[PDB]
Coordinates of C-alpha atoms and ligand atoms in Angstrom, one line a residue:
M131 CA -8.8 35.9 165.0
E132 CA -4.8 35.3 164.9
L133 CA -3.6 33.6 161.7
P134 CA 0.0 32.7 161.5
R135 CA 1.5 33.5 158.0
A136 CA 0.8 30.4 156.1
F137 CA -0.7 28.8 152.8
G138 CA -2.9 26.4 151.8
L139 CA -4.5 24.7 149.0
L140 CA -7.9 24.9 147.4
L141 CA -9.5 21.4 146.2
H142 CA -13.1 20.4 146.5
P143 CA -13.3 16.8 147.5
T144 CA -15.1 15.8 144.2
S145 CA -11.9 16.8 142.3
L146 CA -9.9 14.2 144.2
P147 CA -8.6 11.2 141.9
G148 CA -10.0 7.8 142.4
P149 CA -12.6 5.1 141.3
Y150 CA -15.9 5.2 140.9
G151 CA -16.6 8.4 139.3
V152 CA -15.9 11.2 142.1
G153 CA -13.6 12.1 144.5
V154 CA -14.5 10.7 148.0
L155 CA -13.5 10.7 151.8
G156 CA -11.1 8.2 151.8
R157 CA -7.4 7.4 150.9
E158 CA -7.0 9.7 148.0
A159 CA -8.3 12.6 150.1
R160 CA -5.6 11.3 153.0
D161 CA -3.1 11.2 150.3
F162 CA -3.8 15.0 149.4
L163 CA -3.7 15.9 152.9
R164 CA -0.1 14.1 153.0
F165 CA 1.0 16.1 149.8
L166 CA -0.2 19.2 151.4
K167 CA 1.7 18.5 154.5
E168 CA 4.9 17.6 152.8
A169 CA 4.6 20.8 150.6
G170 CA 4.2 22.7 153.9
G171 CA 0.8 23.9 153.5
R172 CA -1.2 24.3 156.8
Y173 CA -4.7 24.7 155.3
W174 CA -7.3 22.9 152.8
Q175 CA -9.9 24.9 151.8
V176 CA -13.1 23.3 150.2
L177 CA -16.5 24.5 148.8
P178 CA -19.8 23.9 150.4
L179 CA -20.2 20.2 151.2
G180 CA -24.2 19.8 151.1
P181 CA -26.2 17.4 149.1
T182 CA -26.5 19.1 145.3
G183 CA -29.1 19.0 142.8
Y184 CA -29.4 19.6 139.0
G185 CA -26.5 21.5 137.7
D186 CA -24.3 20.3 140.7
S187 CA -23.7 23.5 142.3
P188 CA -22.4 23.2 146.0
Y189 CA -23.8 26.6 146.5
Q190 CA -27.5 25.5 145.9
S191 CA -27.9 22.6 148.4
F192 CA -30.9 20.5 149.5
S193 CA -29.7 21.2 153.0
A194 CA -27.8 23.7 155.2
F195 CA -26.9 20.8 157.7
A196 CA -26.7 17.5 155.4
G197 CA -23.3 16.3 153.9
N198 CA -23.2 15.3 150.0
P199 CA -24.1 11.6 149.6
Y200 CA -21.7 11.9 146.5
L201 CA -18.6 12.0 148.4
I202 CA -19.2 9.0 150.3
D203 CA -16.5 6.4 149.6
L204 CA -18.2 3.1 148.8
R205 CA -15.2 0.9 149.4
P206 CA -15.6 0.5 153.0
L207 CA -19.0 -0.8 152.3
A208 CA -18.0 -3.2 149.5
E209 CA -15.5 -4.5 152.0
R210 CA -17.9 -5.5 154.2
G211 CA -20.0 -7.0 151.5
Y212 CA -22.9 -4.4 151.6
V213 CA -22.5 -4.1 148.0
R214 CA -21.1 -5.2 144.8
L215 CA -19.5 -2.2 142.9
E216 CA -19.0 -1.9 139.1
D217 CA -17.7 0.7 137.3
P218 CA -20.1 1.6 134.5
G219 CA -17.5 3.6 132.5
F220 CA -16.5 6.8 134.7
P221 CA -14.4 9.1 132.6
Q222 CA -10.7 10.3 133.8
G223 CA -10.0 13.8 134.9
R224 CA -13.9 14.9 135.5
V225 CA -16.8 14.1 137.3
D226 CA -19.8 13.0 134.9
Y227 CA -22.6 13.9 136.9
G228 CA -25.4 12.4 134.9
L229 CA -23.7 9.0 135.3
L230 CA -23.0 9.5 138.6
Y231 CA -26.7 10.2 139.6
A232 CA -27.7 7.1 137.8
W233 CA -25.2 5.0 139.2
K234 CA -24.0 6.3 142.6
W235 CA -27.6 6.2 144.2
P236 CA -28.4 2.8 143.4
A237 CA -25.2 1.7 144.8
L238 CA -25.8 3.6 148.0
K239 CA -29.3 2.1 148.0
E240 CA -27.9 -1.5 147.5
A241 CA -25.1 -1.0 150.2
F242 CA -28.1 0.3 152.4
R243 CA -29.8 -3.1 151.8
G244 CA -26.7 -5.3 152.2
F245 CA -26.1 -3.2 155.7
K246 CA -29.7 -3.9 157.1
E247 CA -28.8 -7.5 156.2
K248 CA -25.3 -8.1 157.4
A249 CA -24.1 -5.2 159.9
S250 CA -23.0 -6.0 163.3
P251 CA -24.7 -4.9 166.4
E252 CA -22.1 -2.1 166.8
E253 CA -22.7 -0.7 163.4
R254 CA -26.3 -0.8 164.1
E255 CA -25.9 1.0 167.3
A256 CA -23.9 3.5 165.9
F257 CA -26.1 4.5 163.2
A258 CA -29.2 4.4 165.7
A259 CA -27.2 7.0 167.8
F260 CA -26.6 9.2 165.0
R261 CA -30.1 9.3 164.2
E262 CA -31.1 10.4 167.5
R263 CA -28.2 12.9 168.2
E264 CA -28.9 14.9 164.7
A265 CA -32.6 14.3 164.6
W266 CA -32.7 18.3 165.4
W267 CA -32.2 18.5 161.7
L268 CA -31.6 15.0 160.3
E269 CA -35.7 14.3 160.6
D270 CA -36.5 17.1 158.4
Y271 CA -33.7 16.4 155.8
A272 CA -34.3 12.5 155.7
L273 CA -38.1 13.4 155.2
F274 CA -37.4 15.9 152.9
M275 CA -35.0 13.6 150.4
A276 CA -37.7 10.9 150.6
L277 CA -40.7 12.9 150.0
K278 CA -38.6 14.6 147.1
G279 CA -38.0 11.3 145.7
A280 CA -41.6 10.2 146.3
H281 CA -43.0 13.2 144.3
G282 CA -40.7 13.1 141.2
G283 CA -37.7 15.4 142.4
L284 CA -40.5 18.3 142.7
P285 CA -38.9 21.5 144.9
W286 CA -40.8 21.1 148.2
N287 CA -43.1 24.1 147.5
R288 CA -44.5 22.3 144.6
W289 CA -45.7 19.2 146.7
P290 CA -49.2 18.6 147.9
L291 CA -50.3 21.0 150.3
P292 CA -50.3 19.1 153.4
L293 CA -46.7 17.8 153.0
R294 CA -45.7 21.1 151.9
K295 CA -47.4 23.1 154.8
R296 CA -46.0 20.2 157.0
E297 CA -49.4 19.2 158.7
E298 CA -48.5 17.1 161.3
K299 CA -50.8 14.1 160.8
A300 CA -49.7 14.2 157.0
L301 CA -46.2 14.1 157.9
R302 CA -46.4 11.5 160.4
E303 CA -48.3 9.3 157.6
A304 CA -45.6 10.3 155.0
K305 CA -42.9 9.3 157.4
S306 CA -44.4 5.9 158.0
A307 CA -44.9 5.2 154.3
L308 CA -41.5 6.3 153.2
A309 CA -39.8 4.9 156.6
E310 CA -37.1 3.1 154.6
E311 CA -36.5 5.9 152.2
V312 CA -36.1 8.0 155.1
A313 CA -33.8 5.8 156.7
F314 CA -31.9 5.2 153.7
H315 CA -31.0 9.3 153.6
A316 CA -30.3 9.1 157.4
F317 CA -27.8 6.0 156.4
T318 CA -26.1 8.3 154.0
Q319 CA -25.6 11.1 156.5
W320 CA -24.2 8.7 158.9
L321 CA -21.8 7.4 156.4
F322 CA -20.8 11.0 155.2
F323 CA -20.5 12.2 158.9
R324 CA -18.2 9.2 160.0
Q325 CA -15.8 9.5 156.9
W326 CA -15.6 13.5 157.3
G327 CA -15.0 13.0 160.9
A328 CA -12.0 10.6 160.1
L329 CA -10.5 12.7 157.4
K330 CA -11.0 15.6 159.7
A331 CA -8.9 13.7 162.3
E332 CA -6.3 12.7 159.9
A333 CA -6.0 16.5 158.9
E334 CA -5.3 17.4 162.6
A335 CA -2.8 14.8 162.7
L336 CA -1.1 16.1 160.0
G337 CA -1.3 19.7 161.5
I338 CA -3.7 20.9 158.5
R339 CA -6.9 22.9 159.4
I340 CA -9.9 22.9 157.1
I341 CA -11.6 25.9 155.7
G342 CA -15.0 24.9 154.9
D343 CA -17.5 27.2 152.9
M344 CA -21.1 28.4 153.9
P345 CA -23.1 30.7 151.7
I346 CA -24.7 33.2 153.5
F347 CA -28.2 32.4 152.0
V348 CA -29.6 29.0 151.7
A349 CA -31.3 27.5 149.0
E350 CA -35.1 27.9 148.1
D351 CA -35.5 24.0 147.7
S352 CA -34.3 22.8 150.9
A353 CA -35.2 20.8 154.1
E354 CA -34.8 24.1 156.4
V355 CA -36.6 26.3 154.4
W356 CA -39.4 23.8 154.0
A357 CA -39.0 23.1 157.8
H358 CA -38.9 26.6 159.0
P359 CA -41.0 28.9 156.6
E360 CA -41.1 31.4 159.9
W361 CA -37.6 32.0 159.2
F362 CA -37.9 33.2 155.5
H363 CA -39.8 35.8 153.7
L364 CA -42.2 33.0 152.0
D365 CA -45.9 33.5 151.2
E366 CA -48.5 31.1 152.4
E367 CA -47.9 28.8 149.3
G368 CA -44.2 28.6 150.3
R369 CA -42.9 30.9 147.6
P370 CA -39.9 33.3 148.4
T371 CA -41.9 37.4 148.2
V372 CA -38.4 38.5 147.9
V373 CA -35.0 36.8 146.8
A374 CA -31.3 37.5 147.0
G375 CA -29.0 39.1 144.5
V376 CA -26.9 42.2 143.9
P377 CA -27.7 45.3 141.9
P378 CA -26.8 46.4 138.5
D379 CA -23.4 48.3 138.4
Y380 CA -20.9 49.3 135.7
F381 CA -20.2 45.8 135.0
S382 CA -24.1 44.8 134.4
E383 CA -27.3 47.2 133.8
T384 CA -29.3 43.9 135.2
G385 CA -27.4 42.9 138.2
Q386 CA -27.7 39.5 139.5
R387 CA -31.0 37.7 140.6
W388 CA -29.6 34.6 142.4
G389 CA -33.2 33.7 143.9
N390 CA -32.3 32.4 147.3
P391 CA -34.8 33.0 150.1
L392 CA -34.2 35.7 152.6
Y393 CA -34.0 35.6 156.2
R394 CA -36.7 37.1 158.3
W395 CA -34.0 38.8 160.6
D396 CA -36.2 40.0 163.2
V397 CA -37.7 36.6 163.6
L398 CA -34.1 35.1 163.8
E399 CA -32.9 37.9 166.3
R400 CA -35.7 37.2 168.7
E401 CA -34.8 33.5 168.7
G402 CA -31.3 34.3 169.8
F403 CA -30.1 33.9 166.1
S404 CA -30.6 30.1 166.6
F405 CA -30.6 29.0 163.1
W406 CA -27.3 30.4 162.6
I407 CA -25.9 29.4 165.8
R408 CA -26.8 25.8 164.8
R409 CA -25.5 26.3 161.4
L410 CA -22.1 27.3 162.6
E411 CA -22.1 24.7 165.6
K412 CA -22.7 21.9 162.9
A413 CA -19.9 23.4 160.3
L414 CA -17.4 23.6 163.3
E415 CA -17.8 19.9 163.8
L416 CA -16.4 19.7 160.4
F417 CA -14.3 22.5 160.1
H418 CA -11.8 24.8 161.8
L419 CA -12.6 27.9 159.8
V420 CA -15.6 28.9 158.0
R421 CA -15.6 30.8 154.9
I422 CA -19.1 32.9 154.4
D423 CA -19.8 33.8 150.7
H424 CA -21.3 37.2 150.2
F425 CA -20.4 38.1 154.0
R426 CA -21.5 41.9 153.1
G427 CA -25.2 40.4 153.5
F428 CA -24.7 40.5 157.3
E429 CA -24.4 44.2 157.0
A430 CA -27.1 44.9 154.2
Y431 CA -28.3 42.8 151.4
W432 CA -29.9 43.7 148.1
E433 CA -33.7 42.6 148.6
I434 CA -35.2 41.7 145.1
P435 CA -39.0 41.5 144.9
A436 CA -39.5 38.0 143.7
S437 CA -41.8 38.9 140.9
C438 CA -39.0 40.6 139.5
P439 CA -37.0 38.6 137.0
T440 CA -33.9 40.5 137.3
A441 CA -32.0 42.4 139.9
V442 CA -33.3 45.9 139.1
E443 CA -36.1 46.3 141.3
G444 CA -34.3 45.8 144.9
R445 CA -33.1 47.9 147.7
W446 CA -30.6 47.8 150.2
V447 CA -31.9 46.2 153.6
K448 CA -29.8 46.4 156.8
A449 CA -29.2 42.9 158.4
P450 CA -28.3 42.7 162.2
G451 CA -24.6 41.5 161.5
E452 CA -23.6 43.3 164.7
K453 CA -25.8 41.6 167.1
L454 CA -25.3 38.3 165.1
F455 CA -21.7 38.1 165.3
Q456 CA -21.7 39.2 168.9
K457 CA -24.2 36.3 169.8
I458 CA -21.6 33.8 167.7
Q459 CA -18.4 35.5 169.6
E460 CA -20.8 34.8 172.8
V461 CA -21.4 31.1 171.8
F462 CA -18.4 30.0 170.4
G463 CA -16.0 32.2 172.1
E464 CA -14.4 33.4 168.9
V465 CA -15.7 34.1 165.5
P466 CA -13.8 31.4 163.3
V467 CA -14.8 33.2 160.1
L468 CA -13.2 34.2 156.8
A469 CA -15.1 36.8 154.9
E470 CA -15.7 36.5 151.2
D471 CA -16.0 40.2 150.6
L472 CA -15.1 40.4 147.0
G473 CA -15.6 43.8 145.4
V474 CA -17.4 45.4 148.2
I475 CA -15.3 48.6 149.1
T476 CA -18.0 49.6 151.6
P477 CA -16.9 51.2 154.9
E478 CA -19.4 49.6 157.1
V479 CA -18.7 46.2 156.0
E480 CA -15.1 46.6 156.7
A481 CA -15.9 47.7 160.2
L482 CA -18.2 44.8 160.9
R483 CA -15.5 42.5 159.6
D484 CA -12.5 44.0 161.4
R485 CA -14.8 44.2 164.6
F486 CA -14.7 40.7 165.0
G487 CA -11.3 40.2 163.5
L488 CA -12.5 38.5 160.4
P489 CA -10.3 38.4 157.6
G490 CA -11.4 39.3 154.0
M491 CA -10.2 38.3 150.5
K492 CA -8.1 39.2 147.8
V493 CA -7.9 37.8 144.2
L494 CA -4.9 38.3 142.3
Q495 CA -6.5 37.6 138.9
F496 CA -8.7 40.9 139.4
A497 CA -5.7 42.8 140.3
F498 CA -4.3 44.2 137.0
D499 CA -7.1 45.6 134.8
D500 CA -6.6 49.0 135.9
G501 CA -4.1 51.2 138.2
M502 CA -2.1 50.8 141.4
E503 CA -5.0 51.8 143.6
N504 CA -6.5 48.5 142.7
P505 CA -7.2 46.8 146.3
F506 CA -6.2 43.5 145.1
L507 CA -2.5 44.6 144.5
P508 CA -0.4 43.4 147.3
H509 CA 0.9 46.6 148.3
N510 CA -2.8 47.7 148.9
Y511 CA -3.5 45.1 151.6
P512 CA -3.9 46.1 155.2
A513 CA -0.8 46.0 157.3
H514 CA -2.4 43.7 159.8
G515 CA -2.5 41.1 157.1
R516 CA -5.8 39.8 158.0
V517 CA -6.9 38.9 154.8
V518 CA -6.6 35.6 152.5
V519 CA -5.2 36.1 149.0
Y520 CA -5.9 33.8 146.0
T521 CA -4.9 33.5 142.4
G522 CA -8.1 32.5 141.5
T523 CA -11.3 31.0 143.3
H524 CA -13.3 28.1 142.1
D525 CA -15.4 30.9 140.1
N526 CA -12.3 32.1 138.2
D527 CA -10.8 30.4 135.5
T528 CA -7.2 28.9 136.2
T529 CA -4.5 31.5 136.3
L530 CA -3.0 29.9 132.9
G531 CA -6.6 30.1 131.3
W532 CA -7.3 33.8 132.6
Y533 CA -3.4 34.7 131.2
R534 CA -4.6 33.3 127.8
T535 CA -7.3 35.6 127.5
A536 CA -6.1 38.6 129.8
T537 CA -6.0 42.0 128.1
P538 CA -2.7 43.5 126.5
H539 CA -3.0 46.0 129.4
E540 CA -3.4 43.2 132.4
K541 CA -0.9 41.0 130.7
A542 CA 1.9 44.0 130.6
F543 CA 1.1 45.5 134.1
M544 CA 1.2 41.9 135.6
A545 CA 4.7 41.4 134.3
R546 CA 5.7 44.7 135.4
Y547 CA 4.4 44.3 138.9
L548 CA 6.0 41.2 139.2
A549 CA 9.2 42.4 138.5
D550 CA 8.7 45.1 140.7
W551 CA 8.3 42.4 143.3
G552 CA 11.4 40.4 142.3
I553 CA 9.5 37.9 140.2
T554 CA 9.5 36.9 136.7
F555 CA 8.7 34.1 134.1
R556 CA 9.5 32.8 131.0
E557 CA 6.7 30.5 129.3
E558 CA 3.0 30.9 129.7
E559 CA 2.8 28.1 132.2
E560 CA 4.9 29.7 134.5
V561 CA 2.3 32.6 135.2
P562 CA 0.3 30.9 137.8
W563 CA 3.6 30.1 139.7
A564 CA 4.7 33.6 139.5
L565 CA 1.3 34.9 140.6
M566 CA 1.4 32.2 143.6
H567 CA 5.0 33.5 144.3
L568 CA 3.3 37.2 144.2
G569 CA 0.6 36.2 146.7
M570 CA 3.0 34.5 149.1
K571 CA 5.7 37.5 149.2
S572 CA 2.5 39.7 150.4
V573 CA 1.8 40.4 153.6
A574 CA -1.4 38.3 153.7
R575 CA -1.5 35.9 156.7
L576 CA -2.7 33.3 154.2
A577 CA -2.4 32.5 150.7
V578 CA -4.7 29.7 149.3
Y579 CA -4.4 28.4 145.7
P580 CA -6.3 26.0 143.7
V581 CA -4.4 23.0 142.9
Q582 CA -5.2 23.6 139.1
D583 CA -2.8 26.6 139.5
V584 CA 0.0 24.2 141.2
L585 CA -0.7 21.9 138.1
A586 CA -0.6 25.2 135.6
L587 CA -3.8 23.6 134.1
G588 CA -5.4 25.9 131.3
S589 CA -9.1 26.6 131.0
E590 CA -10.2 23.0 130.4
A591 CA -9.6 22.6 134.6
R592 CA -11.7 25.5 135.4
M593 CA -13.9 24.7 138.2
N594 CA -17.0 26.9 137.6
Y595 CA -17.8 29.6 135.0
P596 CA -20.6 31.5 136.3
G597 CA -23.2 32.0 133.6
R598 CA -22.1 28.9 131.7
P599 CA -24.9 26.1 131.3
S600 CA -22.6 23.0 131.8
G601 CA -19.3 21.8 132.5
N602 CA -19.3 23.2 136.0
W603 CA -17.7 21.5 139.4
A604 CA -16.6 18.6 137.2
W605 CA -12.9 18.8 137.1
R606 CA -10.8 16.0 138.7
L607 CA -7.2 15.3 139.4
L608 CA -5.8 12.5 137.8
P609 CA -4.0 10.1 140.1
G610 CA -0.5 11.1 141.0
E611 CA -1.0 14.3 139.0
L612 CA 0.2 16.3 142.2
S613 CA 4.0 15.1 142.2
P614 CA 6.4 15.3 144.9
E615 CA 7.9 18.0 142.8
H616 CA 4.9 20.0 142.5
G617 CA 5.1 19.9 146.6
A618 CA 8.5 20.6 146.9
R619 CA 8.0 23.8 144.5
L620 CA 5.2 25.2 147.0
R621 CA 7.4 24.3 150.1
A622 CA 10.5 26.1 148.6
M623 CA 8.3 29.1 148.0
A624 CA 6.8 29.1 151.5
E625 CA 10.1 28.7 153.1
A626 CA 11.4 31.5 151.4
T627 CA 8.4 33.9 151.9
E628 CA 8.2 32.6 155.6
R629 CA 5.0 30.7 155.5
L630 CA 6.4 27.5 157.0
Ligands
LIG799 C1 -27.4 14.9 133.2 C2 -27.6 15.6 134.5 O1 -27.4 14.8 135.5 C3 -27.6 15.3 136.8 O2 -29.0 15.2 136.8 C4 -29.9 14.8 137.8 C5 -30.2 15.9 138.8 O3 -29.0 15.9 140.0 C6 -31.3 15.4 139.8 O4 -31.7 16.2 140.8 C7 -32.5 15.1 139.0 O5 -33.2 16.4 138.6 C8 -34.6 16.6 138.4 C9 -34.9 17.3 139.3 O6 -34.6 17.0 140.7 C10 -36.6 18.0 139.3 O7 -36.8 18.9 140.4 C11 -36.9 18.3 137.7 O8 -36.3 19.5 137.7 O9 -36.2 17.3 136.8 C12 -34.9 17.3 137.1 C13 -34.5 16.3 135.7 O10 -34.9 15.0 136.1 O11 -32.4 14.1 137.9 C14 -31.1 14.9 136.8 C15 -31.0 13.9 136.0 O12 -32.1 13.8 135.2 C16 -26.8 16.4 137.3 O13 -27.1 17.6 138.3 C17 -27.0 17.5 135.8 O14 -26.3 18.9 136.1 C18 -26.7 16.8 134.3 N1 -26.8 17.5 133.4 C19 -25.9 17.9 132.3 C20 -25.7 17.4 131.1 C21 -26.6 18.1 130.3 C22 -26.7 17.7 128.9 O15 -26.1 18.0 127.6 C23 -26.9 19.3 130.2 O16 -28.4 19.6 129.9 C24 -26.7 20.0 131.8 O17 -26.5 21.7 132.0 C25 -25.5 19.5 132.3 O18 -25.6 19.9 133.9
LIG800 C1 -26.2 27.8 142.6 C2 -25.1 28.8 141.7 O1 -23.7 28.5 142.2 C3 -22.7 29.1 141.5 O2 -22.8 30.4 142.4 C4 -22.2 30.9 143.6 C5 -20.8 31.1 143.2 O3 -20.1 29.9 142.8 C6 -20.3 31.4 145.0 O4 -18.7 31.5 144.6 C7 -20.9 32.8 145.1 O5 -20.6 33.8 144.6 C8 -21.0 35.3 144.9 C9 -20.3 35.5 146.0 O6 -20.5 35.0 147.3 C10 -21.3 37.0 145.9 O7 -20.3 37.9 147.3 C11 -20.9 37.8 144.8 O8 -19.5 38.2 144.5 O9 -21.3 37.1 143.8 C12 -20.8 35.9 143.5 C13 -21.5 35.1 142.2 O10 -22.0 36.1 141.4 O11 -22.3 32.3 145.5 C14 -22.7 31.8 143.9 C15 -24.6 32.0 143.9 O12 -25.1 33.3 144.4 C16 -22.8 29.3 139.9 O13 -21.8 30.1 139.5 C17 -24.1 30.1 139.6 O14 -24.3 29.8 138.2 C18 -25.2 29.1 140.3 N1 -26.5 29.5 140.0 C19 -27.6 28.8 139.5 C20 -28.9 29.1 140.2 C21 -30.3 29.7 139.4 C22 -31.2 30.2 140.3 O15 -32.4 29.5 139.6 C23 -29.9 30.1 137.9 O16 -29.9 31.3 137.6 C24 -28.6 29.9 137.6 O17 -28.6 29.9 136.1 C25 -28.1 28.4 137.9 O18 -26.7 28.3 137.7

């Protein structure tokens, strides 16, 4: 993949400013694209866009295909009279997910009722047409969500056996009994894709490419796992027999047990990797590039017996990454994938990435805790530049927040390294900019930065803190917070580093 030298910004849509408690796919999203274009940015990166559950993590979605109903802009609906919106008291600068769950679901439900009553024939037709075209994943997703709502939010593998095991007769009866609930969820999808499609066209009109994000492993409690038990290592009761994670290492003697169901790779290969082809086809309708989290899992993954409460009991298992990507190349004619390969250092993963021209990542906040051999330091990046450099990702603190808690060593080495690259700073608040500048001076073809670093926000704006119980995925921009001055500063930096 040939990436021209450029820069972009990382901003999950929920973080957009605007009324009604959460960023949505509307004017403010368009304002951000405009800001990005004026700043000279050519990429907008988001986190996974699927529907979320308790904890609100984009990385644990009810579906590998559905769009997050919380991102639906309700204004176009209120404007056609389908619903009357009333702010129950959403805060500024953050998403109160508890309130959004309590208020937005009913507002979408009311909107659907108003729609059935007032929609024009053209809208009814379009929605029906959408349900037909997307049936191959929508039938399962909409029934999955209807069943979930009818069984008190229980995970699919705790539902009555006939439904859990998808006995046809039982599914047909449920689909019939929950007809309006199924149509309602299908309605949230039609709105989500219509709005995303419009936003994507806006991005394209502005010369902007969108980098989507798809975790390599799906979630246990999701429509596709329920509908395709044959593609995952589950027992007869739908329980994963092995789960994803990573082994212990110098950092943790317990490793990480993520819990995700794992693929029956032999079955997927036999089916021409249909699940993955479908997954990518759907994603390519929404994005120009797809970042895949834990890309190394296509080469080998840490398989943990589900009975083990930690990650200590696993073993590395080879996956057919080569054949899968050969299949992806064959079908799509290119592999529009960005590999999340943080801390892999394994040769075979690098080789698989390179074989298909896939860029990896570099995160500057991790470059100063040791020596000059640290792979995250710019002089160590590959001369071919097929890598995306970030100051920090959604899992890291903002760079100012990181700086304030960095070790004396990190702070001193960073400053010295910056100076070696002709960069300096005076106040703490300037560190995010100095690091963004260091990334832009690097050979990395793409430099992508979280908006919180553009705003030089502290720890209060950190998107996600892995391991922390609450406050995650909630940060939001305030109206007008990204000023023309922020854009001009990014633009001047891009111009100087030849990224325009
Ligand atoms: C306040 C709370 O709002 C959100 O909570 C809702 C979840 O998104 C829903 O999916 C639903 O969760 C139920 C599960 O579906 C069901 O399978 C079962 O496990 O019971 C769950 C509880 O009913 O309903 C949730 C609301 O009740 C949001 O996702 C969640 O993160 C929010 N919780 C935050 C607030 C506090 C209060 O200090 C903390 O305990 C949490 O760590 C925060 O994340
Ligand atoms: C659901 C999960 O969401 C968050 O975790 C994800 C990260 O945000 C992603 O960036 C991605 O990171 C991993 C890299 O892809 C991988 O290559 C390696 O570097 O490890 C990274 C994470 O250590 O994927 C993460 C999901 O694996 C969030 O931080 C995390 O806390 C959330 N976990 C919830 C799920 C379970 C399972 O029941 C519980 O154990 C946790 O307490 C929940 O918070």
